[PDB]
Scaffold this active site. Structure first.
Site, PDB file in Angstrom:
ATOM      1  N   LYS C 162      47.384   6.862 151.234  1.00  0.00           N
ATOM      2  CA  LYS C 162      48.311   7.315 152.270  1.00  0.00           C
ATOM      3  C   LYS C 162      49.192   8.441 151.754  1.00  0.00           C
ATOM      4  O   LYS C 162      49.538   9.359 152.497  1.00  0.00           O
ATOM      5  CB  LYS C 162      49.202   6.173 152.747  1.00  0.00           C
ATOM      6  CG  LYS C 162      48.525   4.952 153.271  1.00  0.00           C
ATOM      7  CD  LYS C 162      49.581   3.993 153.769  1.00  0.00           C
ATOM      8  CE  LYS C 162      50.469   3.492 152.652  1.00  0.00           C
ATOM      9  NZ  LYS C 162      49.755   2.620 151.710  1.00  0.00           N
ATOM     10  N   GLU C 188      59.827   4.449 148.395  1.00  0.00           N
ATOM     11  CA  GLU C 188      58.685   4.964 147.659  1.00  0.00           C
ATOM     12  C   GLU C 188      59.064   5.176 146.203  1.00  0.00           C
ATOM     13  O   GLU C 188      60.198   4.929 145.791  1.00  0.00           O
ATOM     14  CB  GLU C 188      58.191   6.271 148.272  1.00  0.00           C
ATOM     15  CG  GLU C 188      57.482   6.073 149.574  1.00  0.00           C
ATOM     16  CD  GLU C 188      56.148   5.412 149.395  1.00  0.00           C
ATOM     17  OE1 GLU C 188      55.488   5.671 148.367  1.00  0.00           O
ATOM     18  OE2 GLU C 188      55.759   4.621 150.275  1.00  0.00           O
ATOM     19  N   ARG C 189      58.097   5.648 145.426  1.00  0.00           N
ATOM     20  CA  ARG C 189      58.334   5.927 144.020  1.00  0.00           C
ATOM     21  C   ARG C 189      59.282   7.104 143.874  1.00  0.00           C
ATOM     22  O   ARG C 189      59.147   8.111 144.571  1.00  0.00           O
ATOM     23  CB  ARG C 189      57.012   6.230 143.330  1.00  0.00           C
ATOM     24  CG  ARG C 189      56.039   5.104 143.381  1.00  0.00           C
ATOM     25  CD  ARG C 189      54.731   5.517 142.808  1.00  0.00           C
ATOM     26  NE  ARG C 189      53.707   4.495 142.930  1.00  0.00           N
ATOM     27  CZ  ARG C 189      52.938   4.357 143.997  1.00  0.00           C
ATOM     28  NH1 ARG C 189      53.101   5.151 145.038  1.00  0.00           N
ATOM     29  NH2 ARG C 189      52.012   3.421 144.035  1.00  0.00           N
TER      30      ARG C 189
END
Ligand SMILES: Nc1ncnc2c1ncn2[C@@H]1O[C@H](COP(=O)(O)OP(=O)(O)OP(=O)(O)O)[C@@H](O)[C@H]1O
Ligand SMILES: Nc1ncnc2c1ncn2[C@@H]1O[C@H](COP(=O)(O)OP(=O)(O)OP(=O)(O)O)[C@@H](O)[C@H]1O
Ligand SMILES: Nc1ncnc2c1ncn2[C@@H]1O[C@H](COP(=O)(O)OP(=O)(O)O)[C@@H](O)[C@H]1O
Ligand SMILES: [Mg+2]
Ligand SMILES: [Mg+2]
Ligand SMILES: [Mg+2]
Lengths: 179, 499, 478, 290, 108
Positions: C162, C188-189
């Site tokens: 994704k 997210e990261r």
């Protein structure tokens, strides 16, 4: 029993016991019960909507006319701060059961078709302090006609332990003739 | 509710017409199921350490209107009801210093190796913030694991979160242990967190570190399975904060979490006892945020902070390879890559059981050195060929020399990848092994001969021609001078190993 | 002379704040706790009123770490919801949830601020123009063409692609976009936000000098952040997107990776608010929380937001309520597969489970629509045959079913494509594939004029010409 | 009290008056061609609706004597329906499928086919995206289908109480025409989203939940909704109300709780599958299940 | 040396109410002084599993609670279930309580 209503009442008794106002506090607690019977008075204290600040001012005036004990006035103030005024009635009733425990007294209930005399009451109190171990014994009478002739007493820590001879003869004889 | 106990209430009646601050001390209301409710402590901060009469510490987390929920770090099996508590003032810290190297340690950073007290001057927060968006840079140094299958094909850089994921008894602790054993020459401080494991299993690892001198740069944070669920929930945050003391002091650091799987089940144990509404597989909603507080603290820092790093290698156990399970799928979405150790390979004696085709790394080529980028690029394309050639091998059964060579090459490429346990290989030795196996200098050997030949070949180059190690350790590039000087030793070793 | 609260309770990031009886803060208003630490005094604990509790008390959710908060700190009611700087001052800048710059630059010009809670545009103010939108991707342009000015979802579990596919839709489109793009990083990261911030600068989009000509505003609330922060990241990025739609009247791109983490954070604090959860432990207000984000995205008669979202799918389960509540808001859903990513086919887009409103002959054309049907009729028939060929194999199939297996095995590999963003994984250069190249490349497989070529000739090539040139080398090299 | 709006300005301790009435709707002939709210207030921005009477939003269904047998056809233009799964006037035919399979396009083509059939159509769109509802209204109004159609729209930005009441706002409009001797068609685009709005309301009222945390009365939610759709007897003027509910399933899972409820209520179902849909069979009627 | 009272019997689970100071900690053995079917004394051994607050523990019985009454006296042993160990245990069948159930006399 250990429920919130019981928990609060027990605290109130313990402080009285410490300060030796057990007789003095008990009178005030009985005095409170008359106050909170009234639907209008109880409703005002109990409902959330009325402002808490207003409640204290009214409460203070009530205390002054009443002339309640210094802790007893606190105890209601503590209930109001901590929102548990919706269960005042349960708490007040609960205190009486606790108060008997502290004294070491016991309560008894004796019932009859017709009113009876004081020596009978004293001897029933003797027997109840015998079989119960009241340090002291206490007694109550409720006149009920639908029995035949007997007396029923009711005692224990709750209103539990029951002995009688009025109609238990007749219902016993029905249940003994089915044998 | 908890505060209405009738002693607390009774005290209140006596002091109603009074000002008071009970901000210093408190009374234990109840101890059960890993949390304690404490009346009082009217000026504790959220997340503050509180101290008990028995010596148990707890972190004050649920600061309700009349009581405080305290998360007991340890067994509360001695905490007497009614006993006094103490606000420490400090806010969820472990002491941390240089004196933790060589020590096996608790989740409370207390020594459990029987070797006395540890002196420390500074502290670090257990719940400390991760590096931000600008406090980082790109992961570019390699962290060498010594396993050829990682360091050539799934290479881990310094600052990368890489997942070691597989079923039970597939060599997951071994890949983590051999990575720690390889950090002898490098200025990398390893931290090994064993969450909820066999105490016999941790004692073998600590002895293997003592035996090989890896316990001069390693801290071992050991919880066992007999330990309570809060200490197993806590211990990765302890071991990460030990690893952040060196990161922000410009050192490079390597943290291993053995079972992030078992931290997730200890925090599940805690929150179902706390009567919290769970989700999938009865894990709560904070299960993603459990492991992403932890693994976002692993970062290659920027040069404005001194370029510390923290390579995190968490270990997640799967049940029959269920990658779609909730705890493997949460950590895969946090981690930069994963190393699938498969159980079909471990049972077939293909140790280390690294499933090469499914194991990915986000910084692939950025991590490796230029000798590894040049030589192991032909390794990745041959196993792309040999994966398709093992298919329809028995279907065809008439193997021509455009295939029968490329299959018997591909079987001995696996013999390159087999390493023994607790024996890593240096980067010079990895680029020497992958060079010979890719060219086909092993094709005349048998499958029981490649493992014994390359051991004689690396021992030949250590002793007799050390100029190959001088090129790769200095230039860090597979040079034409280095390639010719290696081919001369391949010829001599074929002359020796035949007779 | 703002009304002043006291903290009554601290349960995680959820604070209960006691106010005077005359004045209560409204729901969604921001609260500023005074705050305290060892060194200094941070007022950086911003709250947001969720519930009015009674007894002159609210329930608020913090946007920061609540470690170091004491029962009885002073709380300042801001009197308005959470305001965020918007405009050209936000261009080229990374923001917090709170609208505060993270990128270590000068303070933002807060002349123009905007609240993060606004009602959606009215029904009258919508536009109904159905323009197609080209991305350069063969699965996307052929089988699920995207809506210019509408919500777009990328579905898939962990590790399927994704983020790599959404970095391709930034790469192919946002530099060719005539307006401002907005990225919203929700859970997210932080490494992935560092790479995007470098990818924007290296692509000349965020220029280091003259930063007010940058046409990208980045908003990041990542994995490390408390769950009250990660609820409101998507609303901070959306408020900044709808400034350029309403006031500057520009076309806006709104990339939000990930909107599942917007839901998952709203599920975590909903447990702390004491609410009775819905199915799978999710919050009861799930379709209203999700619809409050997605109905503010729609395009108006002034400007147009196009949003591309990554929706994480837990346990590969599209029947999970947080993927399932997202499907109702989307104009095109691009479901990524794990079984295709396990094969190495990338982008791992399931060509039959990926849908679009746009694939209709009055929109895409009649030449495009009749071939998107014939690809899907071929891949459906080969989908049905994989229980017969699972056990018996290919050998028992009829002459027609073997020909449908043979063509669909070539369609699936020509659906894959090398990406510009994926040149650091594989080393092979990416290929932009136009729709005129895509329609004629699948005309040739379905007409059968390339049935003689091997199937591996179609794997990871841009045009059908590169599939022809690769077919030579597989046939030439001996 | 469950709020028919967001409760943002509402102050704790403020006063609140009881209106005296239960849930009415302004009702007239003037709703034809209007896109309205769940309060029957026009959201298309074309002016106020002139309405004199009122009906109840929760009004009771016709009884057993108030009806007659369904005997008149309601043509949909789809030969797969009008030959094998026929819908008549007074019938409740469920349209059930997966996401993106043709549920709305079956139901829209029914309304579009009623051009000279002299029926009144009501399109209820519960919880549906506003650009999707505006596209349905644009398709209706281009064909001249809006000359006889009401659109009731509650998009997902609205609170859950208005999505819960959007089918009852639409059905009280349909019963206005059913009782004035007209024949009516009502489509509820997404009954499954009515139940999820009602699940949200009942879980914030702290009612004890059941399967998939739906309340126990989510069956009685749709049953008192759908039993309003009926064909009346010749004594009641012989008007009709054909319901066409729409329920989505999760990759064809009819073991799910809400599709299992609505299949049991309606007078039949039209299964649309995605396997027949991708393989060219459009409209994707899965006939042997229908 | 602590006497408690049974507050409730719900299944095999007991709640025992203690005085405010003197209090068992978790896993200690409780010995419920019960009466039998005929009228002899027989005691029921338990184990503290939860400290419920308000000086009240929750115990899970090691034997049958059938015939236990709310308000019987319970001895806090101060220790968990102590069980005989040694060479006196060899060849013997034991209960959970360390009681020999093989009818060969007591464990000396
Ligand atoms: N590379 C190797 N070469 C030879 N033997 C190995 C290797 N790796 C592991 N082993 C052996 O395999 C066994 C399982 O390995 P290990 O215990 O490290 O894996 P694990 O998955 O952590 O096990 P558990 O899940 O039970 O903790 C060990 O006994 C070890 O001796
Ligand atoms: N008979 C048909 N012929 C061709 N295409 C059709 C037919 N019926 C439906 N479709 C196509 O199916 C697509 C999806 O249709 P529709 O939106 O009505 O289904 P849906 O189940 O309502 O979807 P959603 O669940 O997203 O609301 C539409 O783009 C339409 O073009
Ligand atoms: N087009 C591609 N080519 C090669 N590998 C890819 C491609 N797309 C994704 N991948 C692989 O999948 C891995 C994880 O993808 P990612 O975008 O992180 O998935 P998700 O967004 O679901 O977390 C990437 O690191 C990459 O190795
Ligand atoms: Mg292990
Ligand atoms: Mg991703
Ligand atoms: Mg539809």
């Amino acid at each position: 029993v250990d429920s919130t209503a019981s928990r609060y009442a027990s605290a109130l008794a313990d402080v009285a016991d410490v300060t030796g106002t057990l007789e003095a506090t008990n009178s005030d607690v009985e005095k409170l019960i008359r106050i909170f019977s009234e639907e209008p008075v109880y409703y005002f204290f109990a409902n959330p909507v009325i402002s808490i600040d207003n409640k204290r001012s009214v409460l203070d005036e009530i205390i002054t006319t009443s002339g309640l004990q210094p802790h007893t006035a606190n105890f209601i103030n503590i209930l109001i701060d901590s929102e548990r005024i919706n269960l005042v009635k349960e708490i007040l009733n609960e205190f009486e059961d606790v108060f008997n425990k502290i004294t070491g007294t016991e309560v008894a209930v004796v019932t009859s078709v017709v009113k009876l005399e004081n020596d009978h009451l004293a001897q029933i109190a003797k027997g109840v302090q015998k079989i119960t171990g009241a340090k002291n014994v206490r007694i109550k009478t409720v006149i009920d006609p639908s029995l035949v002739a007997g007396f029923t007493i009711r005692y224990g820590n709750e209103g539990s332990k029951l002995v009688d001879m009025s109609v238990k003869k007749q219902l016993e004889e029905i249940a003994a003739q089915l044998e | 509710r908890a505060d209405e106990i009738s002693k607390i209430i009774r005290e209140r009646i006596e002091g109603y017409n009074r000002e008071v601050k009970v901000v210093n001390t408190g009374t234990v209301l109840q101890v059960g199921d890993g949390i304690a409710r404490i009346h009082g402590l009217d000026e504790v901060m959220a997340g503050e350490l509180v101290e008990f009469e028995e010596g148990t510490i707890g972190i004050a987390l649920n600061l309700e209107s009349n009581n405080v929920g305290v998360v007991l770090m340890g067994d509360g099996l001695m905490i007497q009801e009614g006993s006094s508590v103490k606000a420490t003032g400090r806010i969820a810290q472990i002491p941390v210093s240089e004196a933790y190297l060589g020590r096996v340690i608790n989740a409370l950073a207390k020594p459990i190796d029987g070797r006395g007290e540890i002196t420390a001057s500074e502290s670090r927060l257990i719940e400390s913030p991760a590096p931000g968006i600008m406090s980082r840079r790109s992961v570019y140094e390699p962290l060498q694991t010594g396993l050829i299958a990682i360091d050539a094909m799934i290479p881990v850089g310094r600052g990368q979160r890489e997942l070691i994921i597989g079923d039970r008894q597939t060599g997951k602790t071994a890949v983590a242990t051999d990575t720690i054993l390889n950090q002898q020459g490098q200025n990398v401080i390893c931290v090994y967190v064993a969450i909820g494991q066999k105490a016999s299993s941790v004692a073998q690892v600590v002895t293997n570190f003592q035996e090989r001198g890896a316990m001069e740069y390693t801290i071992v944070v050991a919880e066992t399975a007999d330990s309570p669920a809060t200490l197993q929930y806590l211990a990765p945050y302890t071991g990460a904060a030990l690893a952040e003391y060196f990161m922000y002091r410009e050192r490079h650091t390597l943290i291993i979490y053995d079972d992030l799987s078992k931290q997730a089940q200890a925090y599940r144990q805690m929150s179902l006892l706390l009567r919290r509404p769970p989700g999938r597989e009865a894990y709560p909603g904070d299960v993603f945020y459990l492991h992403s507080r932890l693994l976002e603290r692993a970062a290659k820092l920027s040069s404005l902070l001194g370029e510390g790093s923290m390579t995190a290698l968490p270990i997640v156990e799967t049940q029959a390879g269920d990658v779609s399970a909730y705890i493997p799928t949460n950590v895969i979405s946090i981690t930069d890559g994963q190393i699938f150790l498969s159980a079909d390979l471990f049972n077939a004696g293909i140790r280390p059981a690294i499933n090469v085709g499914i194991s990915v790394s986000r910084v692939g080529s950025a991590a490796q050195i230029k000798a590894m980028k040049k030589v192991a690029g032909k390794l990745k394309l041959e196993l792309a060929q040999f994966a398709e050639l093992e298919a329809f091998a028995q279907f065809a059964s008439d193997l021509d020399k455009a295939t029968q060579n490329q299959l018997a090459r591909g079987q001995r490429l696996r013999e390159l990848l087999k390493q023994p346990q607790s024996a890593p290989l240096t980067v010079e030795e990895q680029v020497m092994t992958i060079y010979t196996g890719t060219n086909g200098y092993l094709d005349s050997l048998e499958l029981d001969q490649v493992r014994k030949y390359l051991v004689e070949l690396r021992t030949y180059v250590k002793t007799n021609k050390p100029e190959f190690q001088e090129i790769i350790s200095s230039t860090k590039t597979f040079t034409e001078e280095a390639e010719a000087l290696l081919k001369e030793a391949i010829q001599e070793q074929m002359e020796r190993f035949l007779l | 002379k703002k009304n002043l609260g006291r903290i009554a309770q601290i349960i995680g990031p959820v604070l209960d704040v006691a106010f005077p009886p005359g004045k209560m803060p409204n729901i969604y208003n921001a609260l500023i706790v005074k705050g305290r630490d060892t060194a200094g005094q941070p007022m950086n604990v911003t709250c947001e009123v969720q519930q009015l509790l009674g007894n002159n008390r609210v329930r608020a959710v913090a946007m920061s770490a609540t470690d170091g908060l004491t029962r009885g700190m002073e709380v300042i009611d801001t009197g308005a919801p959470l305001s965020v700087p918007v405009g050209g001052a936000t261009l080229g800048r990374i923001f917090n949830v709170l609208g505060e710059p993270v990128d270590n630059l000068g303070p933002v010009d807060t002349r123009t601020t905007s609240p993060i809670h606004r009602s959606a545009p009215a029904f009258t103010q919508l536009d109904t123009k159905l323009s197609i939108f080209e991305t350069g991707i063969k699965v996307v342009d052929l089988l699920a063409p995207y809506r210019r000015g509408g919500k777009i979802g990328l579905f898939g579990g962990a590790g399927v692609g994704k983020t790599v596919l959404i970095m391709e839709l930034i790469n192919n489109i946002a530099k060719a976009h005539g307006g401002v793009s907005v990225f919203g990083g929700v859970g997210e990261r932080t490494r992935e936000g560092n790479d995007l911030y470098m990818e924007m600068k290296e692509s000349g989009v965020i220029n280091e000098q003259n930063i007010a000509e940058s046409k990208v505003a980045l908003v990041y609330g990542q994995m490390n952040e408390p769950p009250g922060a990660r609820m409101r990241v998507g609303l901070t990025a959306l408020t900044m997107a709808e400034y350029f739609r309403d006031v500057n009247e520009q076309d806006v791109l709104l990339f939000i990776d990930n909107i599942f983490r917007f839901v998952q954070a709203g599920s975590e604090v909903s447990a702390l608010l004491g609410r009775m959860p819905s199915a799978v432990g999710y919050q009861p207000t799930l379709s209203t929380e999700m619809g409050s984000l997605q109905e503010r995205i729609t395009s108006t008669k002034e400007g147009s937001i196009t949003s591309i979202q990554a929706v994480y799918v837990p346990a590969d389960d599209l029947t999970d309520p947080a993927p399932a509540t997202t499907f109702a808001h989307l104009d095109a859903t691009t479901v990524l597969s794990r079984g295709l990513a396990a094969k190495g086919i990338y982008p791992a887009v399931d060509p039959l489970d990926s849908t679009s409103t746009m694939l209709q002959p009055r929109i895409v054309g009649e030449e495009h629509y009749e071939i998107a049907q014939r690809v899907k009729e071929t891949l459906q028939r080969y989908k049905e045959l994989q229980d017969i060929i699972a056990i018996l194999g290919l050998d028992e199939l009829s002459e027609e079913d073997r020909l449908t297996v043979a063509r669909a095995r070539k369609i699936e590999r020509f659906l894959s494509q090398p990406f510009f963003v994926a040149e650091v994984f594989t080393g092979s250069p990416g290929k932009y594939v136009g729709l005129a190249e895509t329609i004629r490349g699948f005309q040739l497989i379905l007409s059968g004029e390339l049935d003689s070529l091997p199937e591996q000739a179609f794997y990871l090539v841009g045009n059908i010409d590169e599939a022809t040139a690769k077919a030579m080398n597989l046939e030439m090299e001996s």
